[PDB]
Amino acid sequence: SVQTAATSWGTVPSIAVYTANNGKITERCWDGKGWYTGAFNEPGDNVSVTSWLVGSAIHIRVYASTGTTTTEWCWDGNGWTKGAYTSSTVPDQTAATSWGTVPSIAVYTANNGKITERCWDGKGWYTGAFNEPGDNVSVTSWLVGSAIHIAVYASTTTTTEWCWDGNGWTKGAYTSSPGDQTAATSWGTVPSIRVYTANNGKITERCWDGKGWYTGAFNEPGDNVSVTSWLVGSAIHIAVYASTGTTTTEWCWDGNGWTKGAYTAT
Ligand SMILES: CCN(CC)c1ccc2c(c1)Oc1cc(N(CC)CC)ccc1C2c1ccccc1C(=O)OCCOCCn1cc(CO[C@@H]2O[C@@H](C)[C@@H](O)[C@@H](O)[C@@H]2O)nn1
Ligand SMILES: CCN(CC)c1ccc2c(c1)Oc1cc(N(CC)CC)ccc1C2c1ccccc1C(=O)OCCOCCn1cc(CO[C@@H]2O[C@@H](C)[C@@H](O)[C@@H](O)[C@@H]2O)nn1
Structure with missing residues (x-):
C-alpha cells in the first residue's frame, strides 16, 4: 500500500500528510478550511516527519x-x-521526533x-546510543519541563517499547507479544500515549494514560497507519491515516467517537 507520515501544529490545527507512492513523496495540507496539495515533491519509498513551532512559524523536517x-x-517558511x-543504508524505514525550539531531533x-x-543537538548530527532489533520502528517523545522522554516501538516475534528517561534506555511496560507496522503519538506530561498497529489489514490501538496499557476503541481496515494529535486545553484531538493500496482514509477523535475525516489525496 502507500506509506504515510503526518505532523500537525497549533490548535486549529494545521496538518501536513506525506504519502510515498511509486518512489515519489507528495504533501496534502489542512489549514482549517479544506485539504490542498503542498509544494513537497521529493523522491522516496518511505517517509517520516517531525515539526516544531518557533513562536508561530512552523519548521518541518x-x-x-x-x-x-x-x-x-527542510521547510523553514x-x-x-x-x-x-x-x-548510509540498504534498500530502510525511519521514525522521527523532535523537542524544544533549538530543536533537538532523534531519527x-x-x-x-x-x-x-x-x-x-543544534551543533551537528551524531550517532545515538540506541541499537536494538527491529524491522519496524515508531517513536513519540514528551518534555517533563526540560527533560525529554522518548518511547520507541520496535517490531521484529514481539513489539518492544524502549524508554529513554534522559540518562539510560530500558524496556517499557508495553509488549503486545508478524509484520506489525506501528505509529505512536502522545500528549501532556503523564503522558497519554496511543500506539496504532497495522497487522493483516486491521489497524488496532493500545492506550496508556499513566496507569497501564489497554485496548482502545480504534479498529479500522488498513495496511499502513500514521497519526498526529493536538491538545486544545484539556481536550485531545487525533487524526489517524489508514491506507490500503492507494486509498488513504482519515479517522478523527474529537472526544466523541472515531469519525471519518474530510482528508482526500485527490
Ligand atoms: C552538505 C555536505 N555535508 C553533509 C555530508 C557536510 C558538510 C560539511 C561538513 C561535513 C559534512 O562533515 C564534517 C565533519 C567534521 N569532523 C567532525 C564533525 C571532522 C573534522 C568537520 C567538518 C565537517 C563539515 C565542515 C567542514 C568545514 C567547515 C564546516 C563544516 C560544517 O559546517 O559542519 C556541519 C554543521 O555545521 C554548520 C552547517 N550547518 C548545517 C545546518 C542545518 O540546519 C538545518 O536544520 C536543523 C534543525 C537540522 O534539521 C539540520 O539537519 C538542517 O540542515 N546549520 N548549519
Ligand atoms: C477503577 C477500577 N476498575 C474496575 C471498576 C477498572 C480498572 C481498570 C480499568 C477500568 C476499570 O476501566 C477501563 C475502561 C476503559 N474504557 C472505557 C470503557 C475504554 C475501552 C479502558 C480501560 C479501563 C481500565 C484499565 C485497564 C487496564 C489498564 C489500565 C486501565 C485504566 O487505565 O483504567 C482507567 C482509565 O481507563 C480509560 C478510560 N477511558 C475511556 C477513554 C476514551 O477512549 C480512548 O481514548 C481515546 C482518546 C481514543 O484513543 C479511544 O480509541 C480510546 O478507547 N479514554 N479513557
Whole structure:
C-alpha cells in the first residue's frame, strides 16, 4: 500500500500528510478550511516527519528513504531545501521526533532487522546510543519541563517499547507479544500515549494514560497507519491515516467517537 507520515501544529490545527507512492513523496495540507496539495515533491519509498513551532512559524523536517540513503528535506517558511542529515543504508524505514525550539531531533532507522539512531543537538548530527532489533520502528517523545522522554516501538516475534528517561534506555511496560507496522503519538506530561498497529489489514490501538496499557476503541481496515494529535486545553484531538493500496482514509477523535475525516489525496 502507500506509506504515510503526518505532523500537525497549533490548535486549529494545521496538518501536513506525506504519502510515498511509486518512489515519489507528495504533501496534502489542512489549514482549517479544506485539504490542498503542498509544494513537497521529493523522491522516496518511505517517509517520516517531525515539526516544531518557533513562536508561530512552523519548521518541518521530512526524512525520505531512497535505497542507500535517507535525505532530510527542510521547510523553514521560504521553500524546501536539503538538510545536513546523512545516512548510509540498504534498500530502510525511519521514525522521527523532535523537542524544544533549538530543536533537538532523534531519527530511528530500521535497516535489515536492526534499529539505529541519529541525533541533532543544534551543533551537528551524531550517532545515538540506541541499537536494538527491529524491522519496524515508531517513536513519540514528551518534555517533563526540560527533560525529554522518548518511547520507541520496535517490531521484529514481539513489539518492544524502549524508554529513554534522559540518562539510560530500558524496556517499557508495553509488549503486545508478524509484520506489525506501528505509529505512536502522545500528549501532556503523564503522558497519554496511543500506539496504532497495522497487522493483516486491521489497524488496532493500545492506550496508556499513566496507569497501564489497554485496548482502545480504534479498529479500522488498513495496511499502513500514521497519526498526529493536538491538545486544545484539556481536550485531545487525533487524526489517524489508514491506507490500503492507494486509498488513504482519515479517522478523527474529537472526544466523541472515531469519525471519518474530510482528508482526500485527490
Ligand atoms: C552538505 C555536505 N555535508 C553533509 C555530508 C557536510 C558538510 C560539511 C561538513 C561535513 C559534512 O562533515 C564534517 C565533519 C567534521 N569532523 C567532525 C564533525 C571532522 C573534522 C568537520 C567538518 C565537517 C563539515 C565542515 C567542514 C568545514 C567547515 C564546516 C563544516 C560544517 O559546517 O559542519 C556541519 C554543521 O555545521 C554548520 C552547517 N550547518 C548545517 C545546518 C542545518 O540546519 C538545518 O536544520 C536543523 C534543525 C537540522 O534539521 C539540520 O539537519 C538542517 O540542515 N546549520 N548549519
Ligand atoms: C477503577 C477500577 N476498575 C474496575 C471498576 C477498572 C480498572 C481498570 C480499568 C477500568 C476499570 O476501566 C477501563 C475502561 C476503559 N474504557 C472505557 C470503557 C475504554 C475501552 C479502558 C480501560 C479501563 C481500565 C484499565 C485497564 C487496564 C489498564 C489500565 C486501565 C485504566 O487505565 O483504567 C482507567 C482509565 O481507563 C480509560 C478510560 N477511558 C475511556 C477513554 C476514551 O477512549 C480512548 O481514548 C481515546 C482518546 C481514543 O484513543 C479511544 O480509541 C480510546 O478507547 N479514554 N479513557
